[model samples]
Target chain A: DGTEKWRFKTGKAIEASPVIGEDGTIYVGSNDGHLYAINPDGTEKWRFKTGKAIEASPVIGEDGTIYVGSNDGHLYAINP
Target chain B: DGTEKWRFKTGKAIEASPVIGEDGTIYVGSNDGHLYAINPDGTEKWRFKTGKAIEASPVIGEDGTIYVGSNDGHLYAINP
Candidate 1:
């Protein structure tokens, strides 16, 4: 497990763990207040910015909606 | 949206969020010191006991491995 496949960077520290989508997309949040959707190869697929830092992990809804909690006192529902 | 499919109970408060497997199995842990696997029909599939209460969320690996952390000071790897 000492192999590094790829890496992606964000503006601030990442406080939440990453979750994978059905198509292998990795979703994670950062203290920079953005939810990042990274491809399986670690490339940036997209990102959704929130009002404040995102410290809670994102959860996928039944319909594939990505839910992320932010310090801004709101839960952002994203569509990937 | 008040259509209730089913309800599954645990020994105590659930501090961890649930994770769904590819087969629609809901995995969650409780402060009562056990992890529960609920089926899509809301039936109880099984439960995993740890040394202490579980406060951390469970994550699934690419190979379908379920990893759970417990206050018991160890990480549990469960394969459904």
Candidate 2:
């Protein structure tokens, strides 16, 4: 419903599928353990950091709660 | 019998196993902050936007619930 999804570069190799939003927003991780948000047209939106690789899938709640885990042995929850 | 599928350029690089839908739609993410859904004919169906880099394999629920994680420390749920 927004711009639409386009592919971009993560600056490193990626091994994750992707977390998608209702508005068509996606969230994903990179090999460098960095999290990034991309617009529909493959533009950078935001990014976050983690201690290790993120191999776990994400879960989004009706309240817009985003939850993910990382290899660094930590779990994070972000509000969108 | 192989290579009938074409590869799309993902900005950074990718090493994830592909998830193909029953309809032959493939879903993947790139370091460039985008998510792609490619049709069996090697064309794009749609893409989603996300905040960070995606690196998790996707899980599709019976009700068409898509769950995935990203490096951005976020999880998402997508419904059709």
Candidate 3:
């Protein structure tokens, strides 16, 4: 089966690759300045708004904090 | 002072980004087909070898399990 899993769209180009969470959630950032959390079945779970575009990929820390960079000149520590 | 902290050598080129652990250990993969764990002070901690080169970045799970992929057609779960 060569079927694709799913296709997700952001307001702008997604230059960073998505990272999968421990519980199968997908975390990705976009140029639209939003960090999105998507379920394994390709459904939207939630989104975190930032001051500027997010070009760096989201990384989860050991303490369950998600570290992300924004063009808005800030590094947001998100509890996800 | 722009002095360099330290430089640790891998058997080959490191094409992947290094992930920082909870205790300040740096985890990185190398073309040498090994996952190296180096202390923040620039000292060797340990190495986990794989059958093939690892081009993918290492991801640490919320449970403290480090996951990495190797060209050897296998995904390894590491305990750091």
Candidate 4:
């Protein structure tokens, strides 16, 4: 059996897995239409509302940009 | 500026991007219920079927295991 290390809740279900940044930040999306940036110590850094359910995972780029998509049919590039 | 190097078709939309293997093979998933392995020259090498759509991207492990998930509620560790 696996043990639970930590957990965080969002407004809706999380369909995507969290991605860890080079600086140890955690990024994930929620079906409630928001992309979340969490700190390494399990604290919320920030979130952006995307206006549609996001089922895709975030991809961190070399320039510190985060790319993700939503059911809204648009791809976003966030300067995180 | 960017130019398209190559492209491939699938039975349905591709929600996951391709992962490049050590030997230049490409791995990706489709909403049409299949996991595809493609060559660098844009040809399909093989495919594995799942019970439902595959929206999760494939992750290659240290020992060369291909891991991915399906909407059918299972995570698969596959061999190339």
Model 4 whole-model lDDT (C-alpha atoms): 0.73
Q: Which scores higher on DockQ, 2 or 3?
A: 2
Lowest-sum lDDT 10-residue window in model 3 chain B: B67-76
TM-score of each: 0.53, 0.51, 0.53, 0.52
- After TM-score superposition, the amount by which residue B19's alpha carbon in candidate 4 deviates from its true location, in angstroms, is 8.6
Model 2: per-residue lDDT, tens digit, A34-64? 7776665457778788888766556778987
Question: Can you write out model 4's per-residue Cα lDDT over A1-80, one digit (the tens) per residue?
Answer: 69776788999998777899998989998889888888887888888777578776776655555656566544455667
Model 3 misplacement above 4 A:
A1-18, A22-80
lDDT of 3 by residue, A1-80 (tens): 11223445556545454677667677777777889887655578898999887766789988778899999999999887
Give lDDT tens digits, candidate 2, residues B1-80.
Answer: 76545757666665456676665667776666666777777777766666767655565534454545555544445543
Q: In model 4, what is the error at residue A63, expressed in angstroms?
A: 0.4
Query: Candidate 3, after superposition: displacement of residue A42 in Å?
Result: 22
- Summarize candidate 1's per-residue lDDT along A3-74 as a digit string, tens digits: 224446667655455677887777777777788887655577898989997766789988899999989999
lDDT of 1 at B45: 77
Error of 4 at B12 (Å): 14
- DockQ of each candidate, alpha-carbon based: 0.04, 0.16, 0.03, 0.06
Give the candidate number with the greatest DockQ.
Answer: 2
lDDT by residue for model 1 over B2-59, one digit each (tens)?
A: 9988888888887667889897888887888887888899988777777667775777
Global Cα lDDT for candidate 1? 0.73
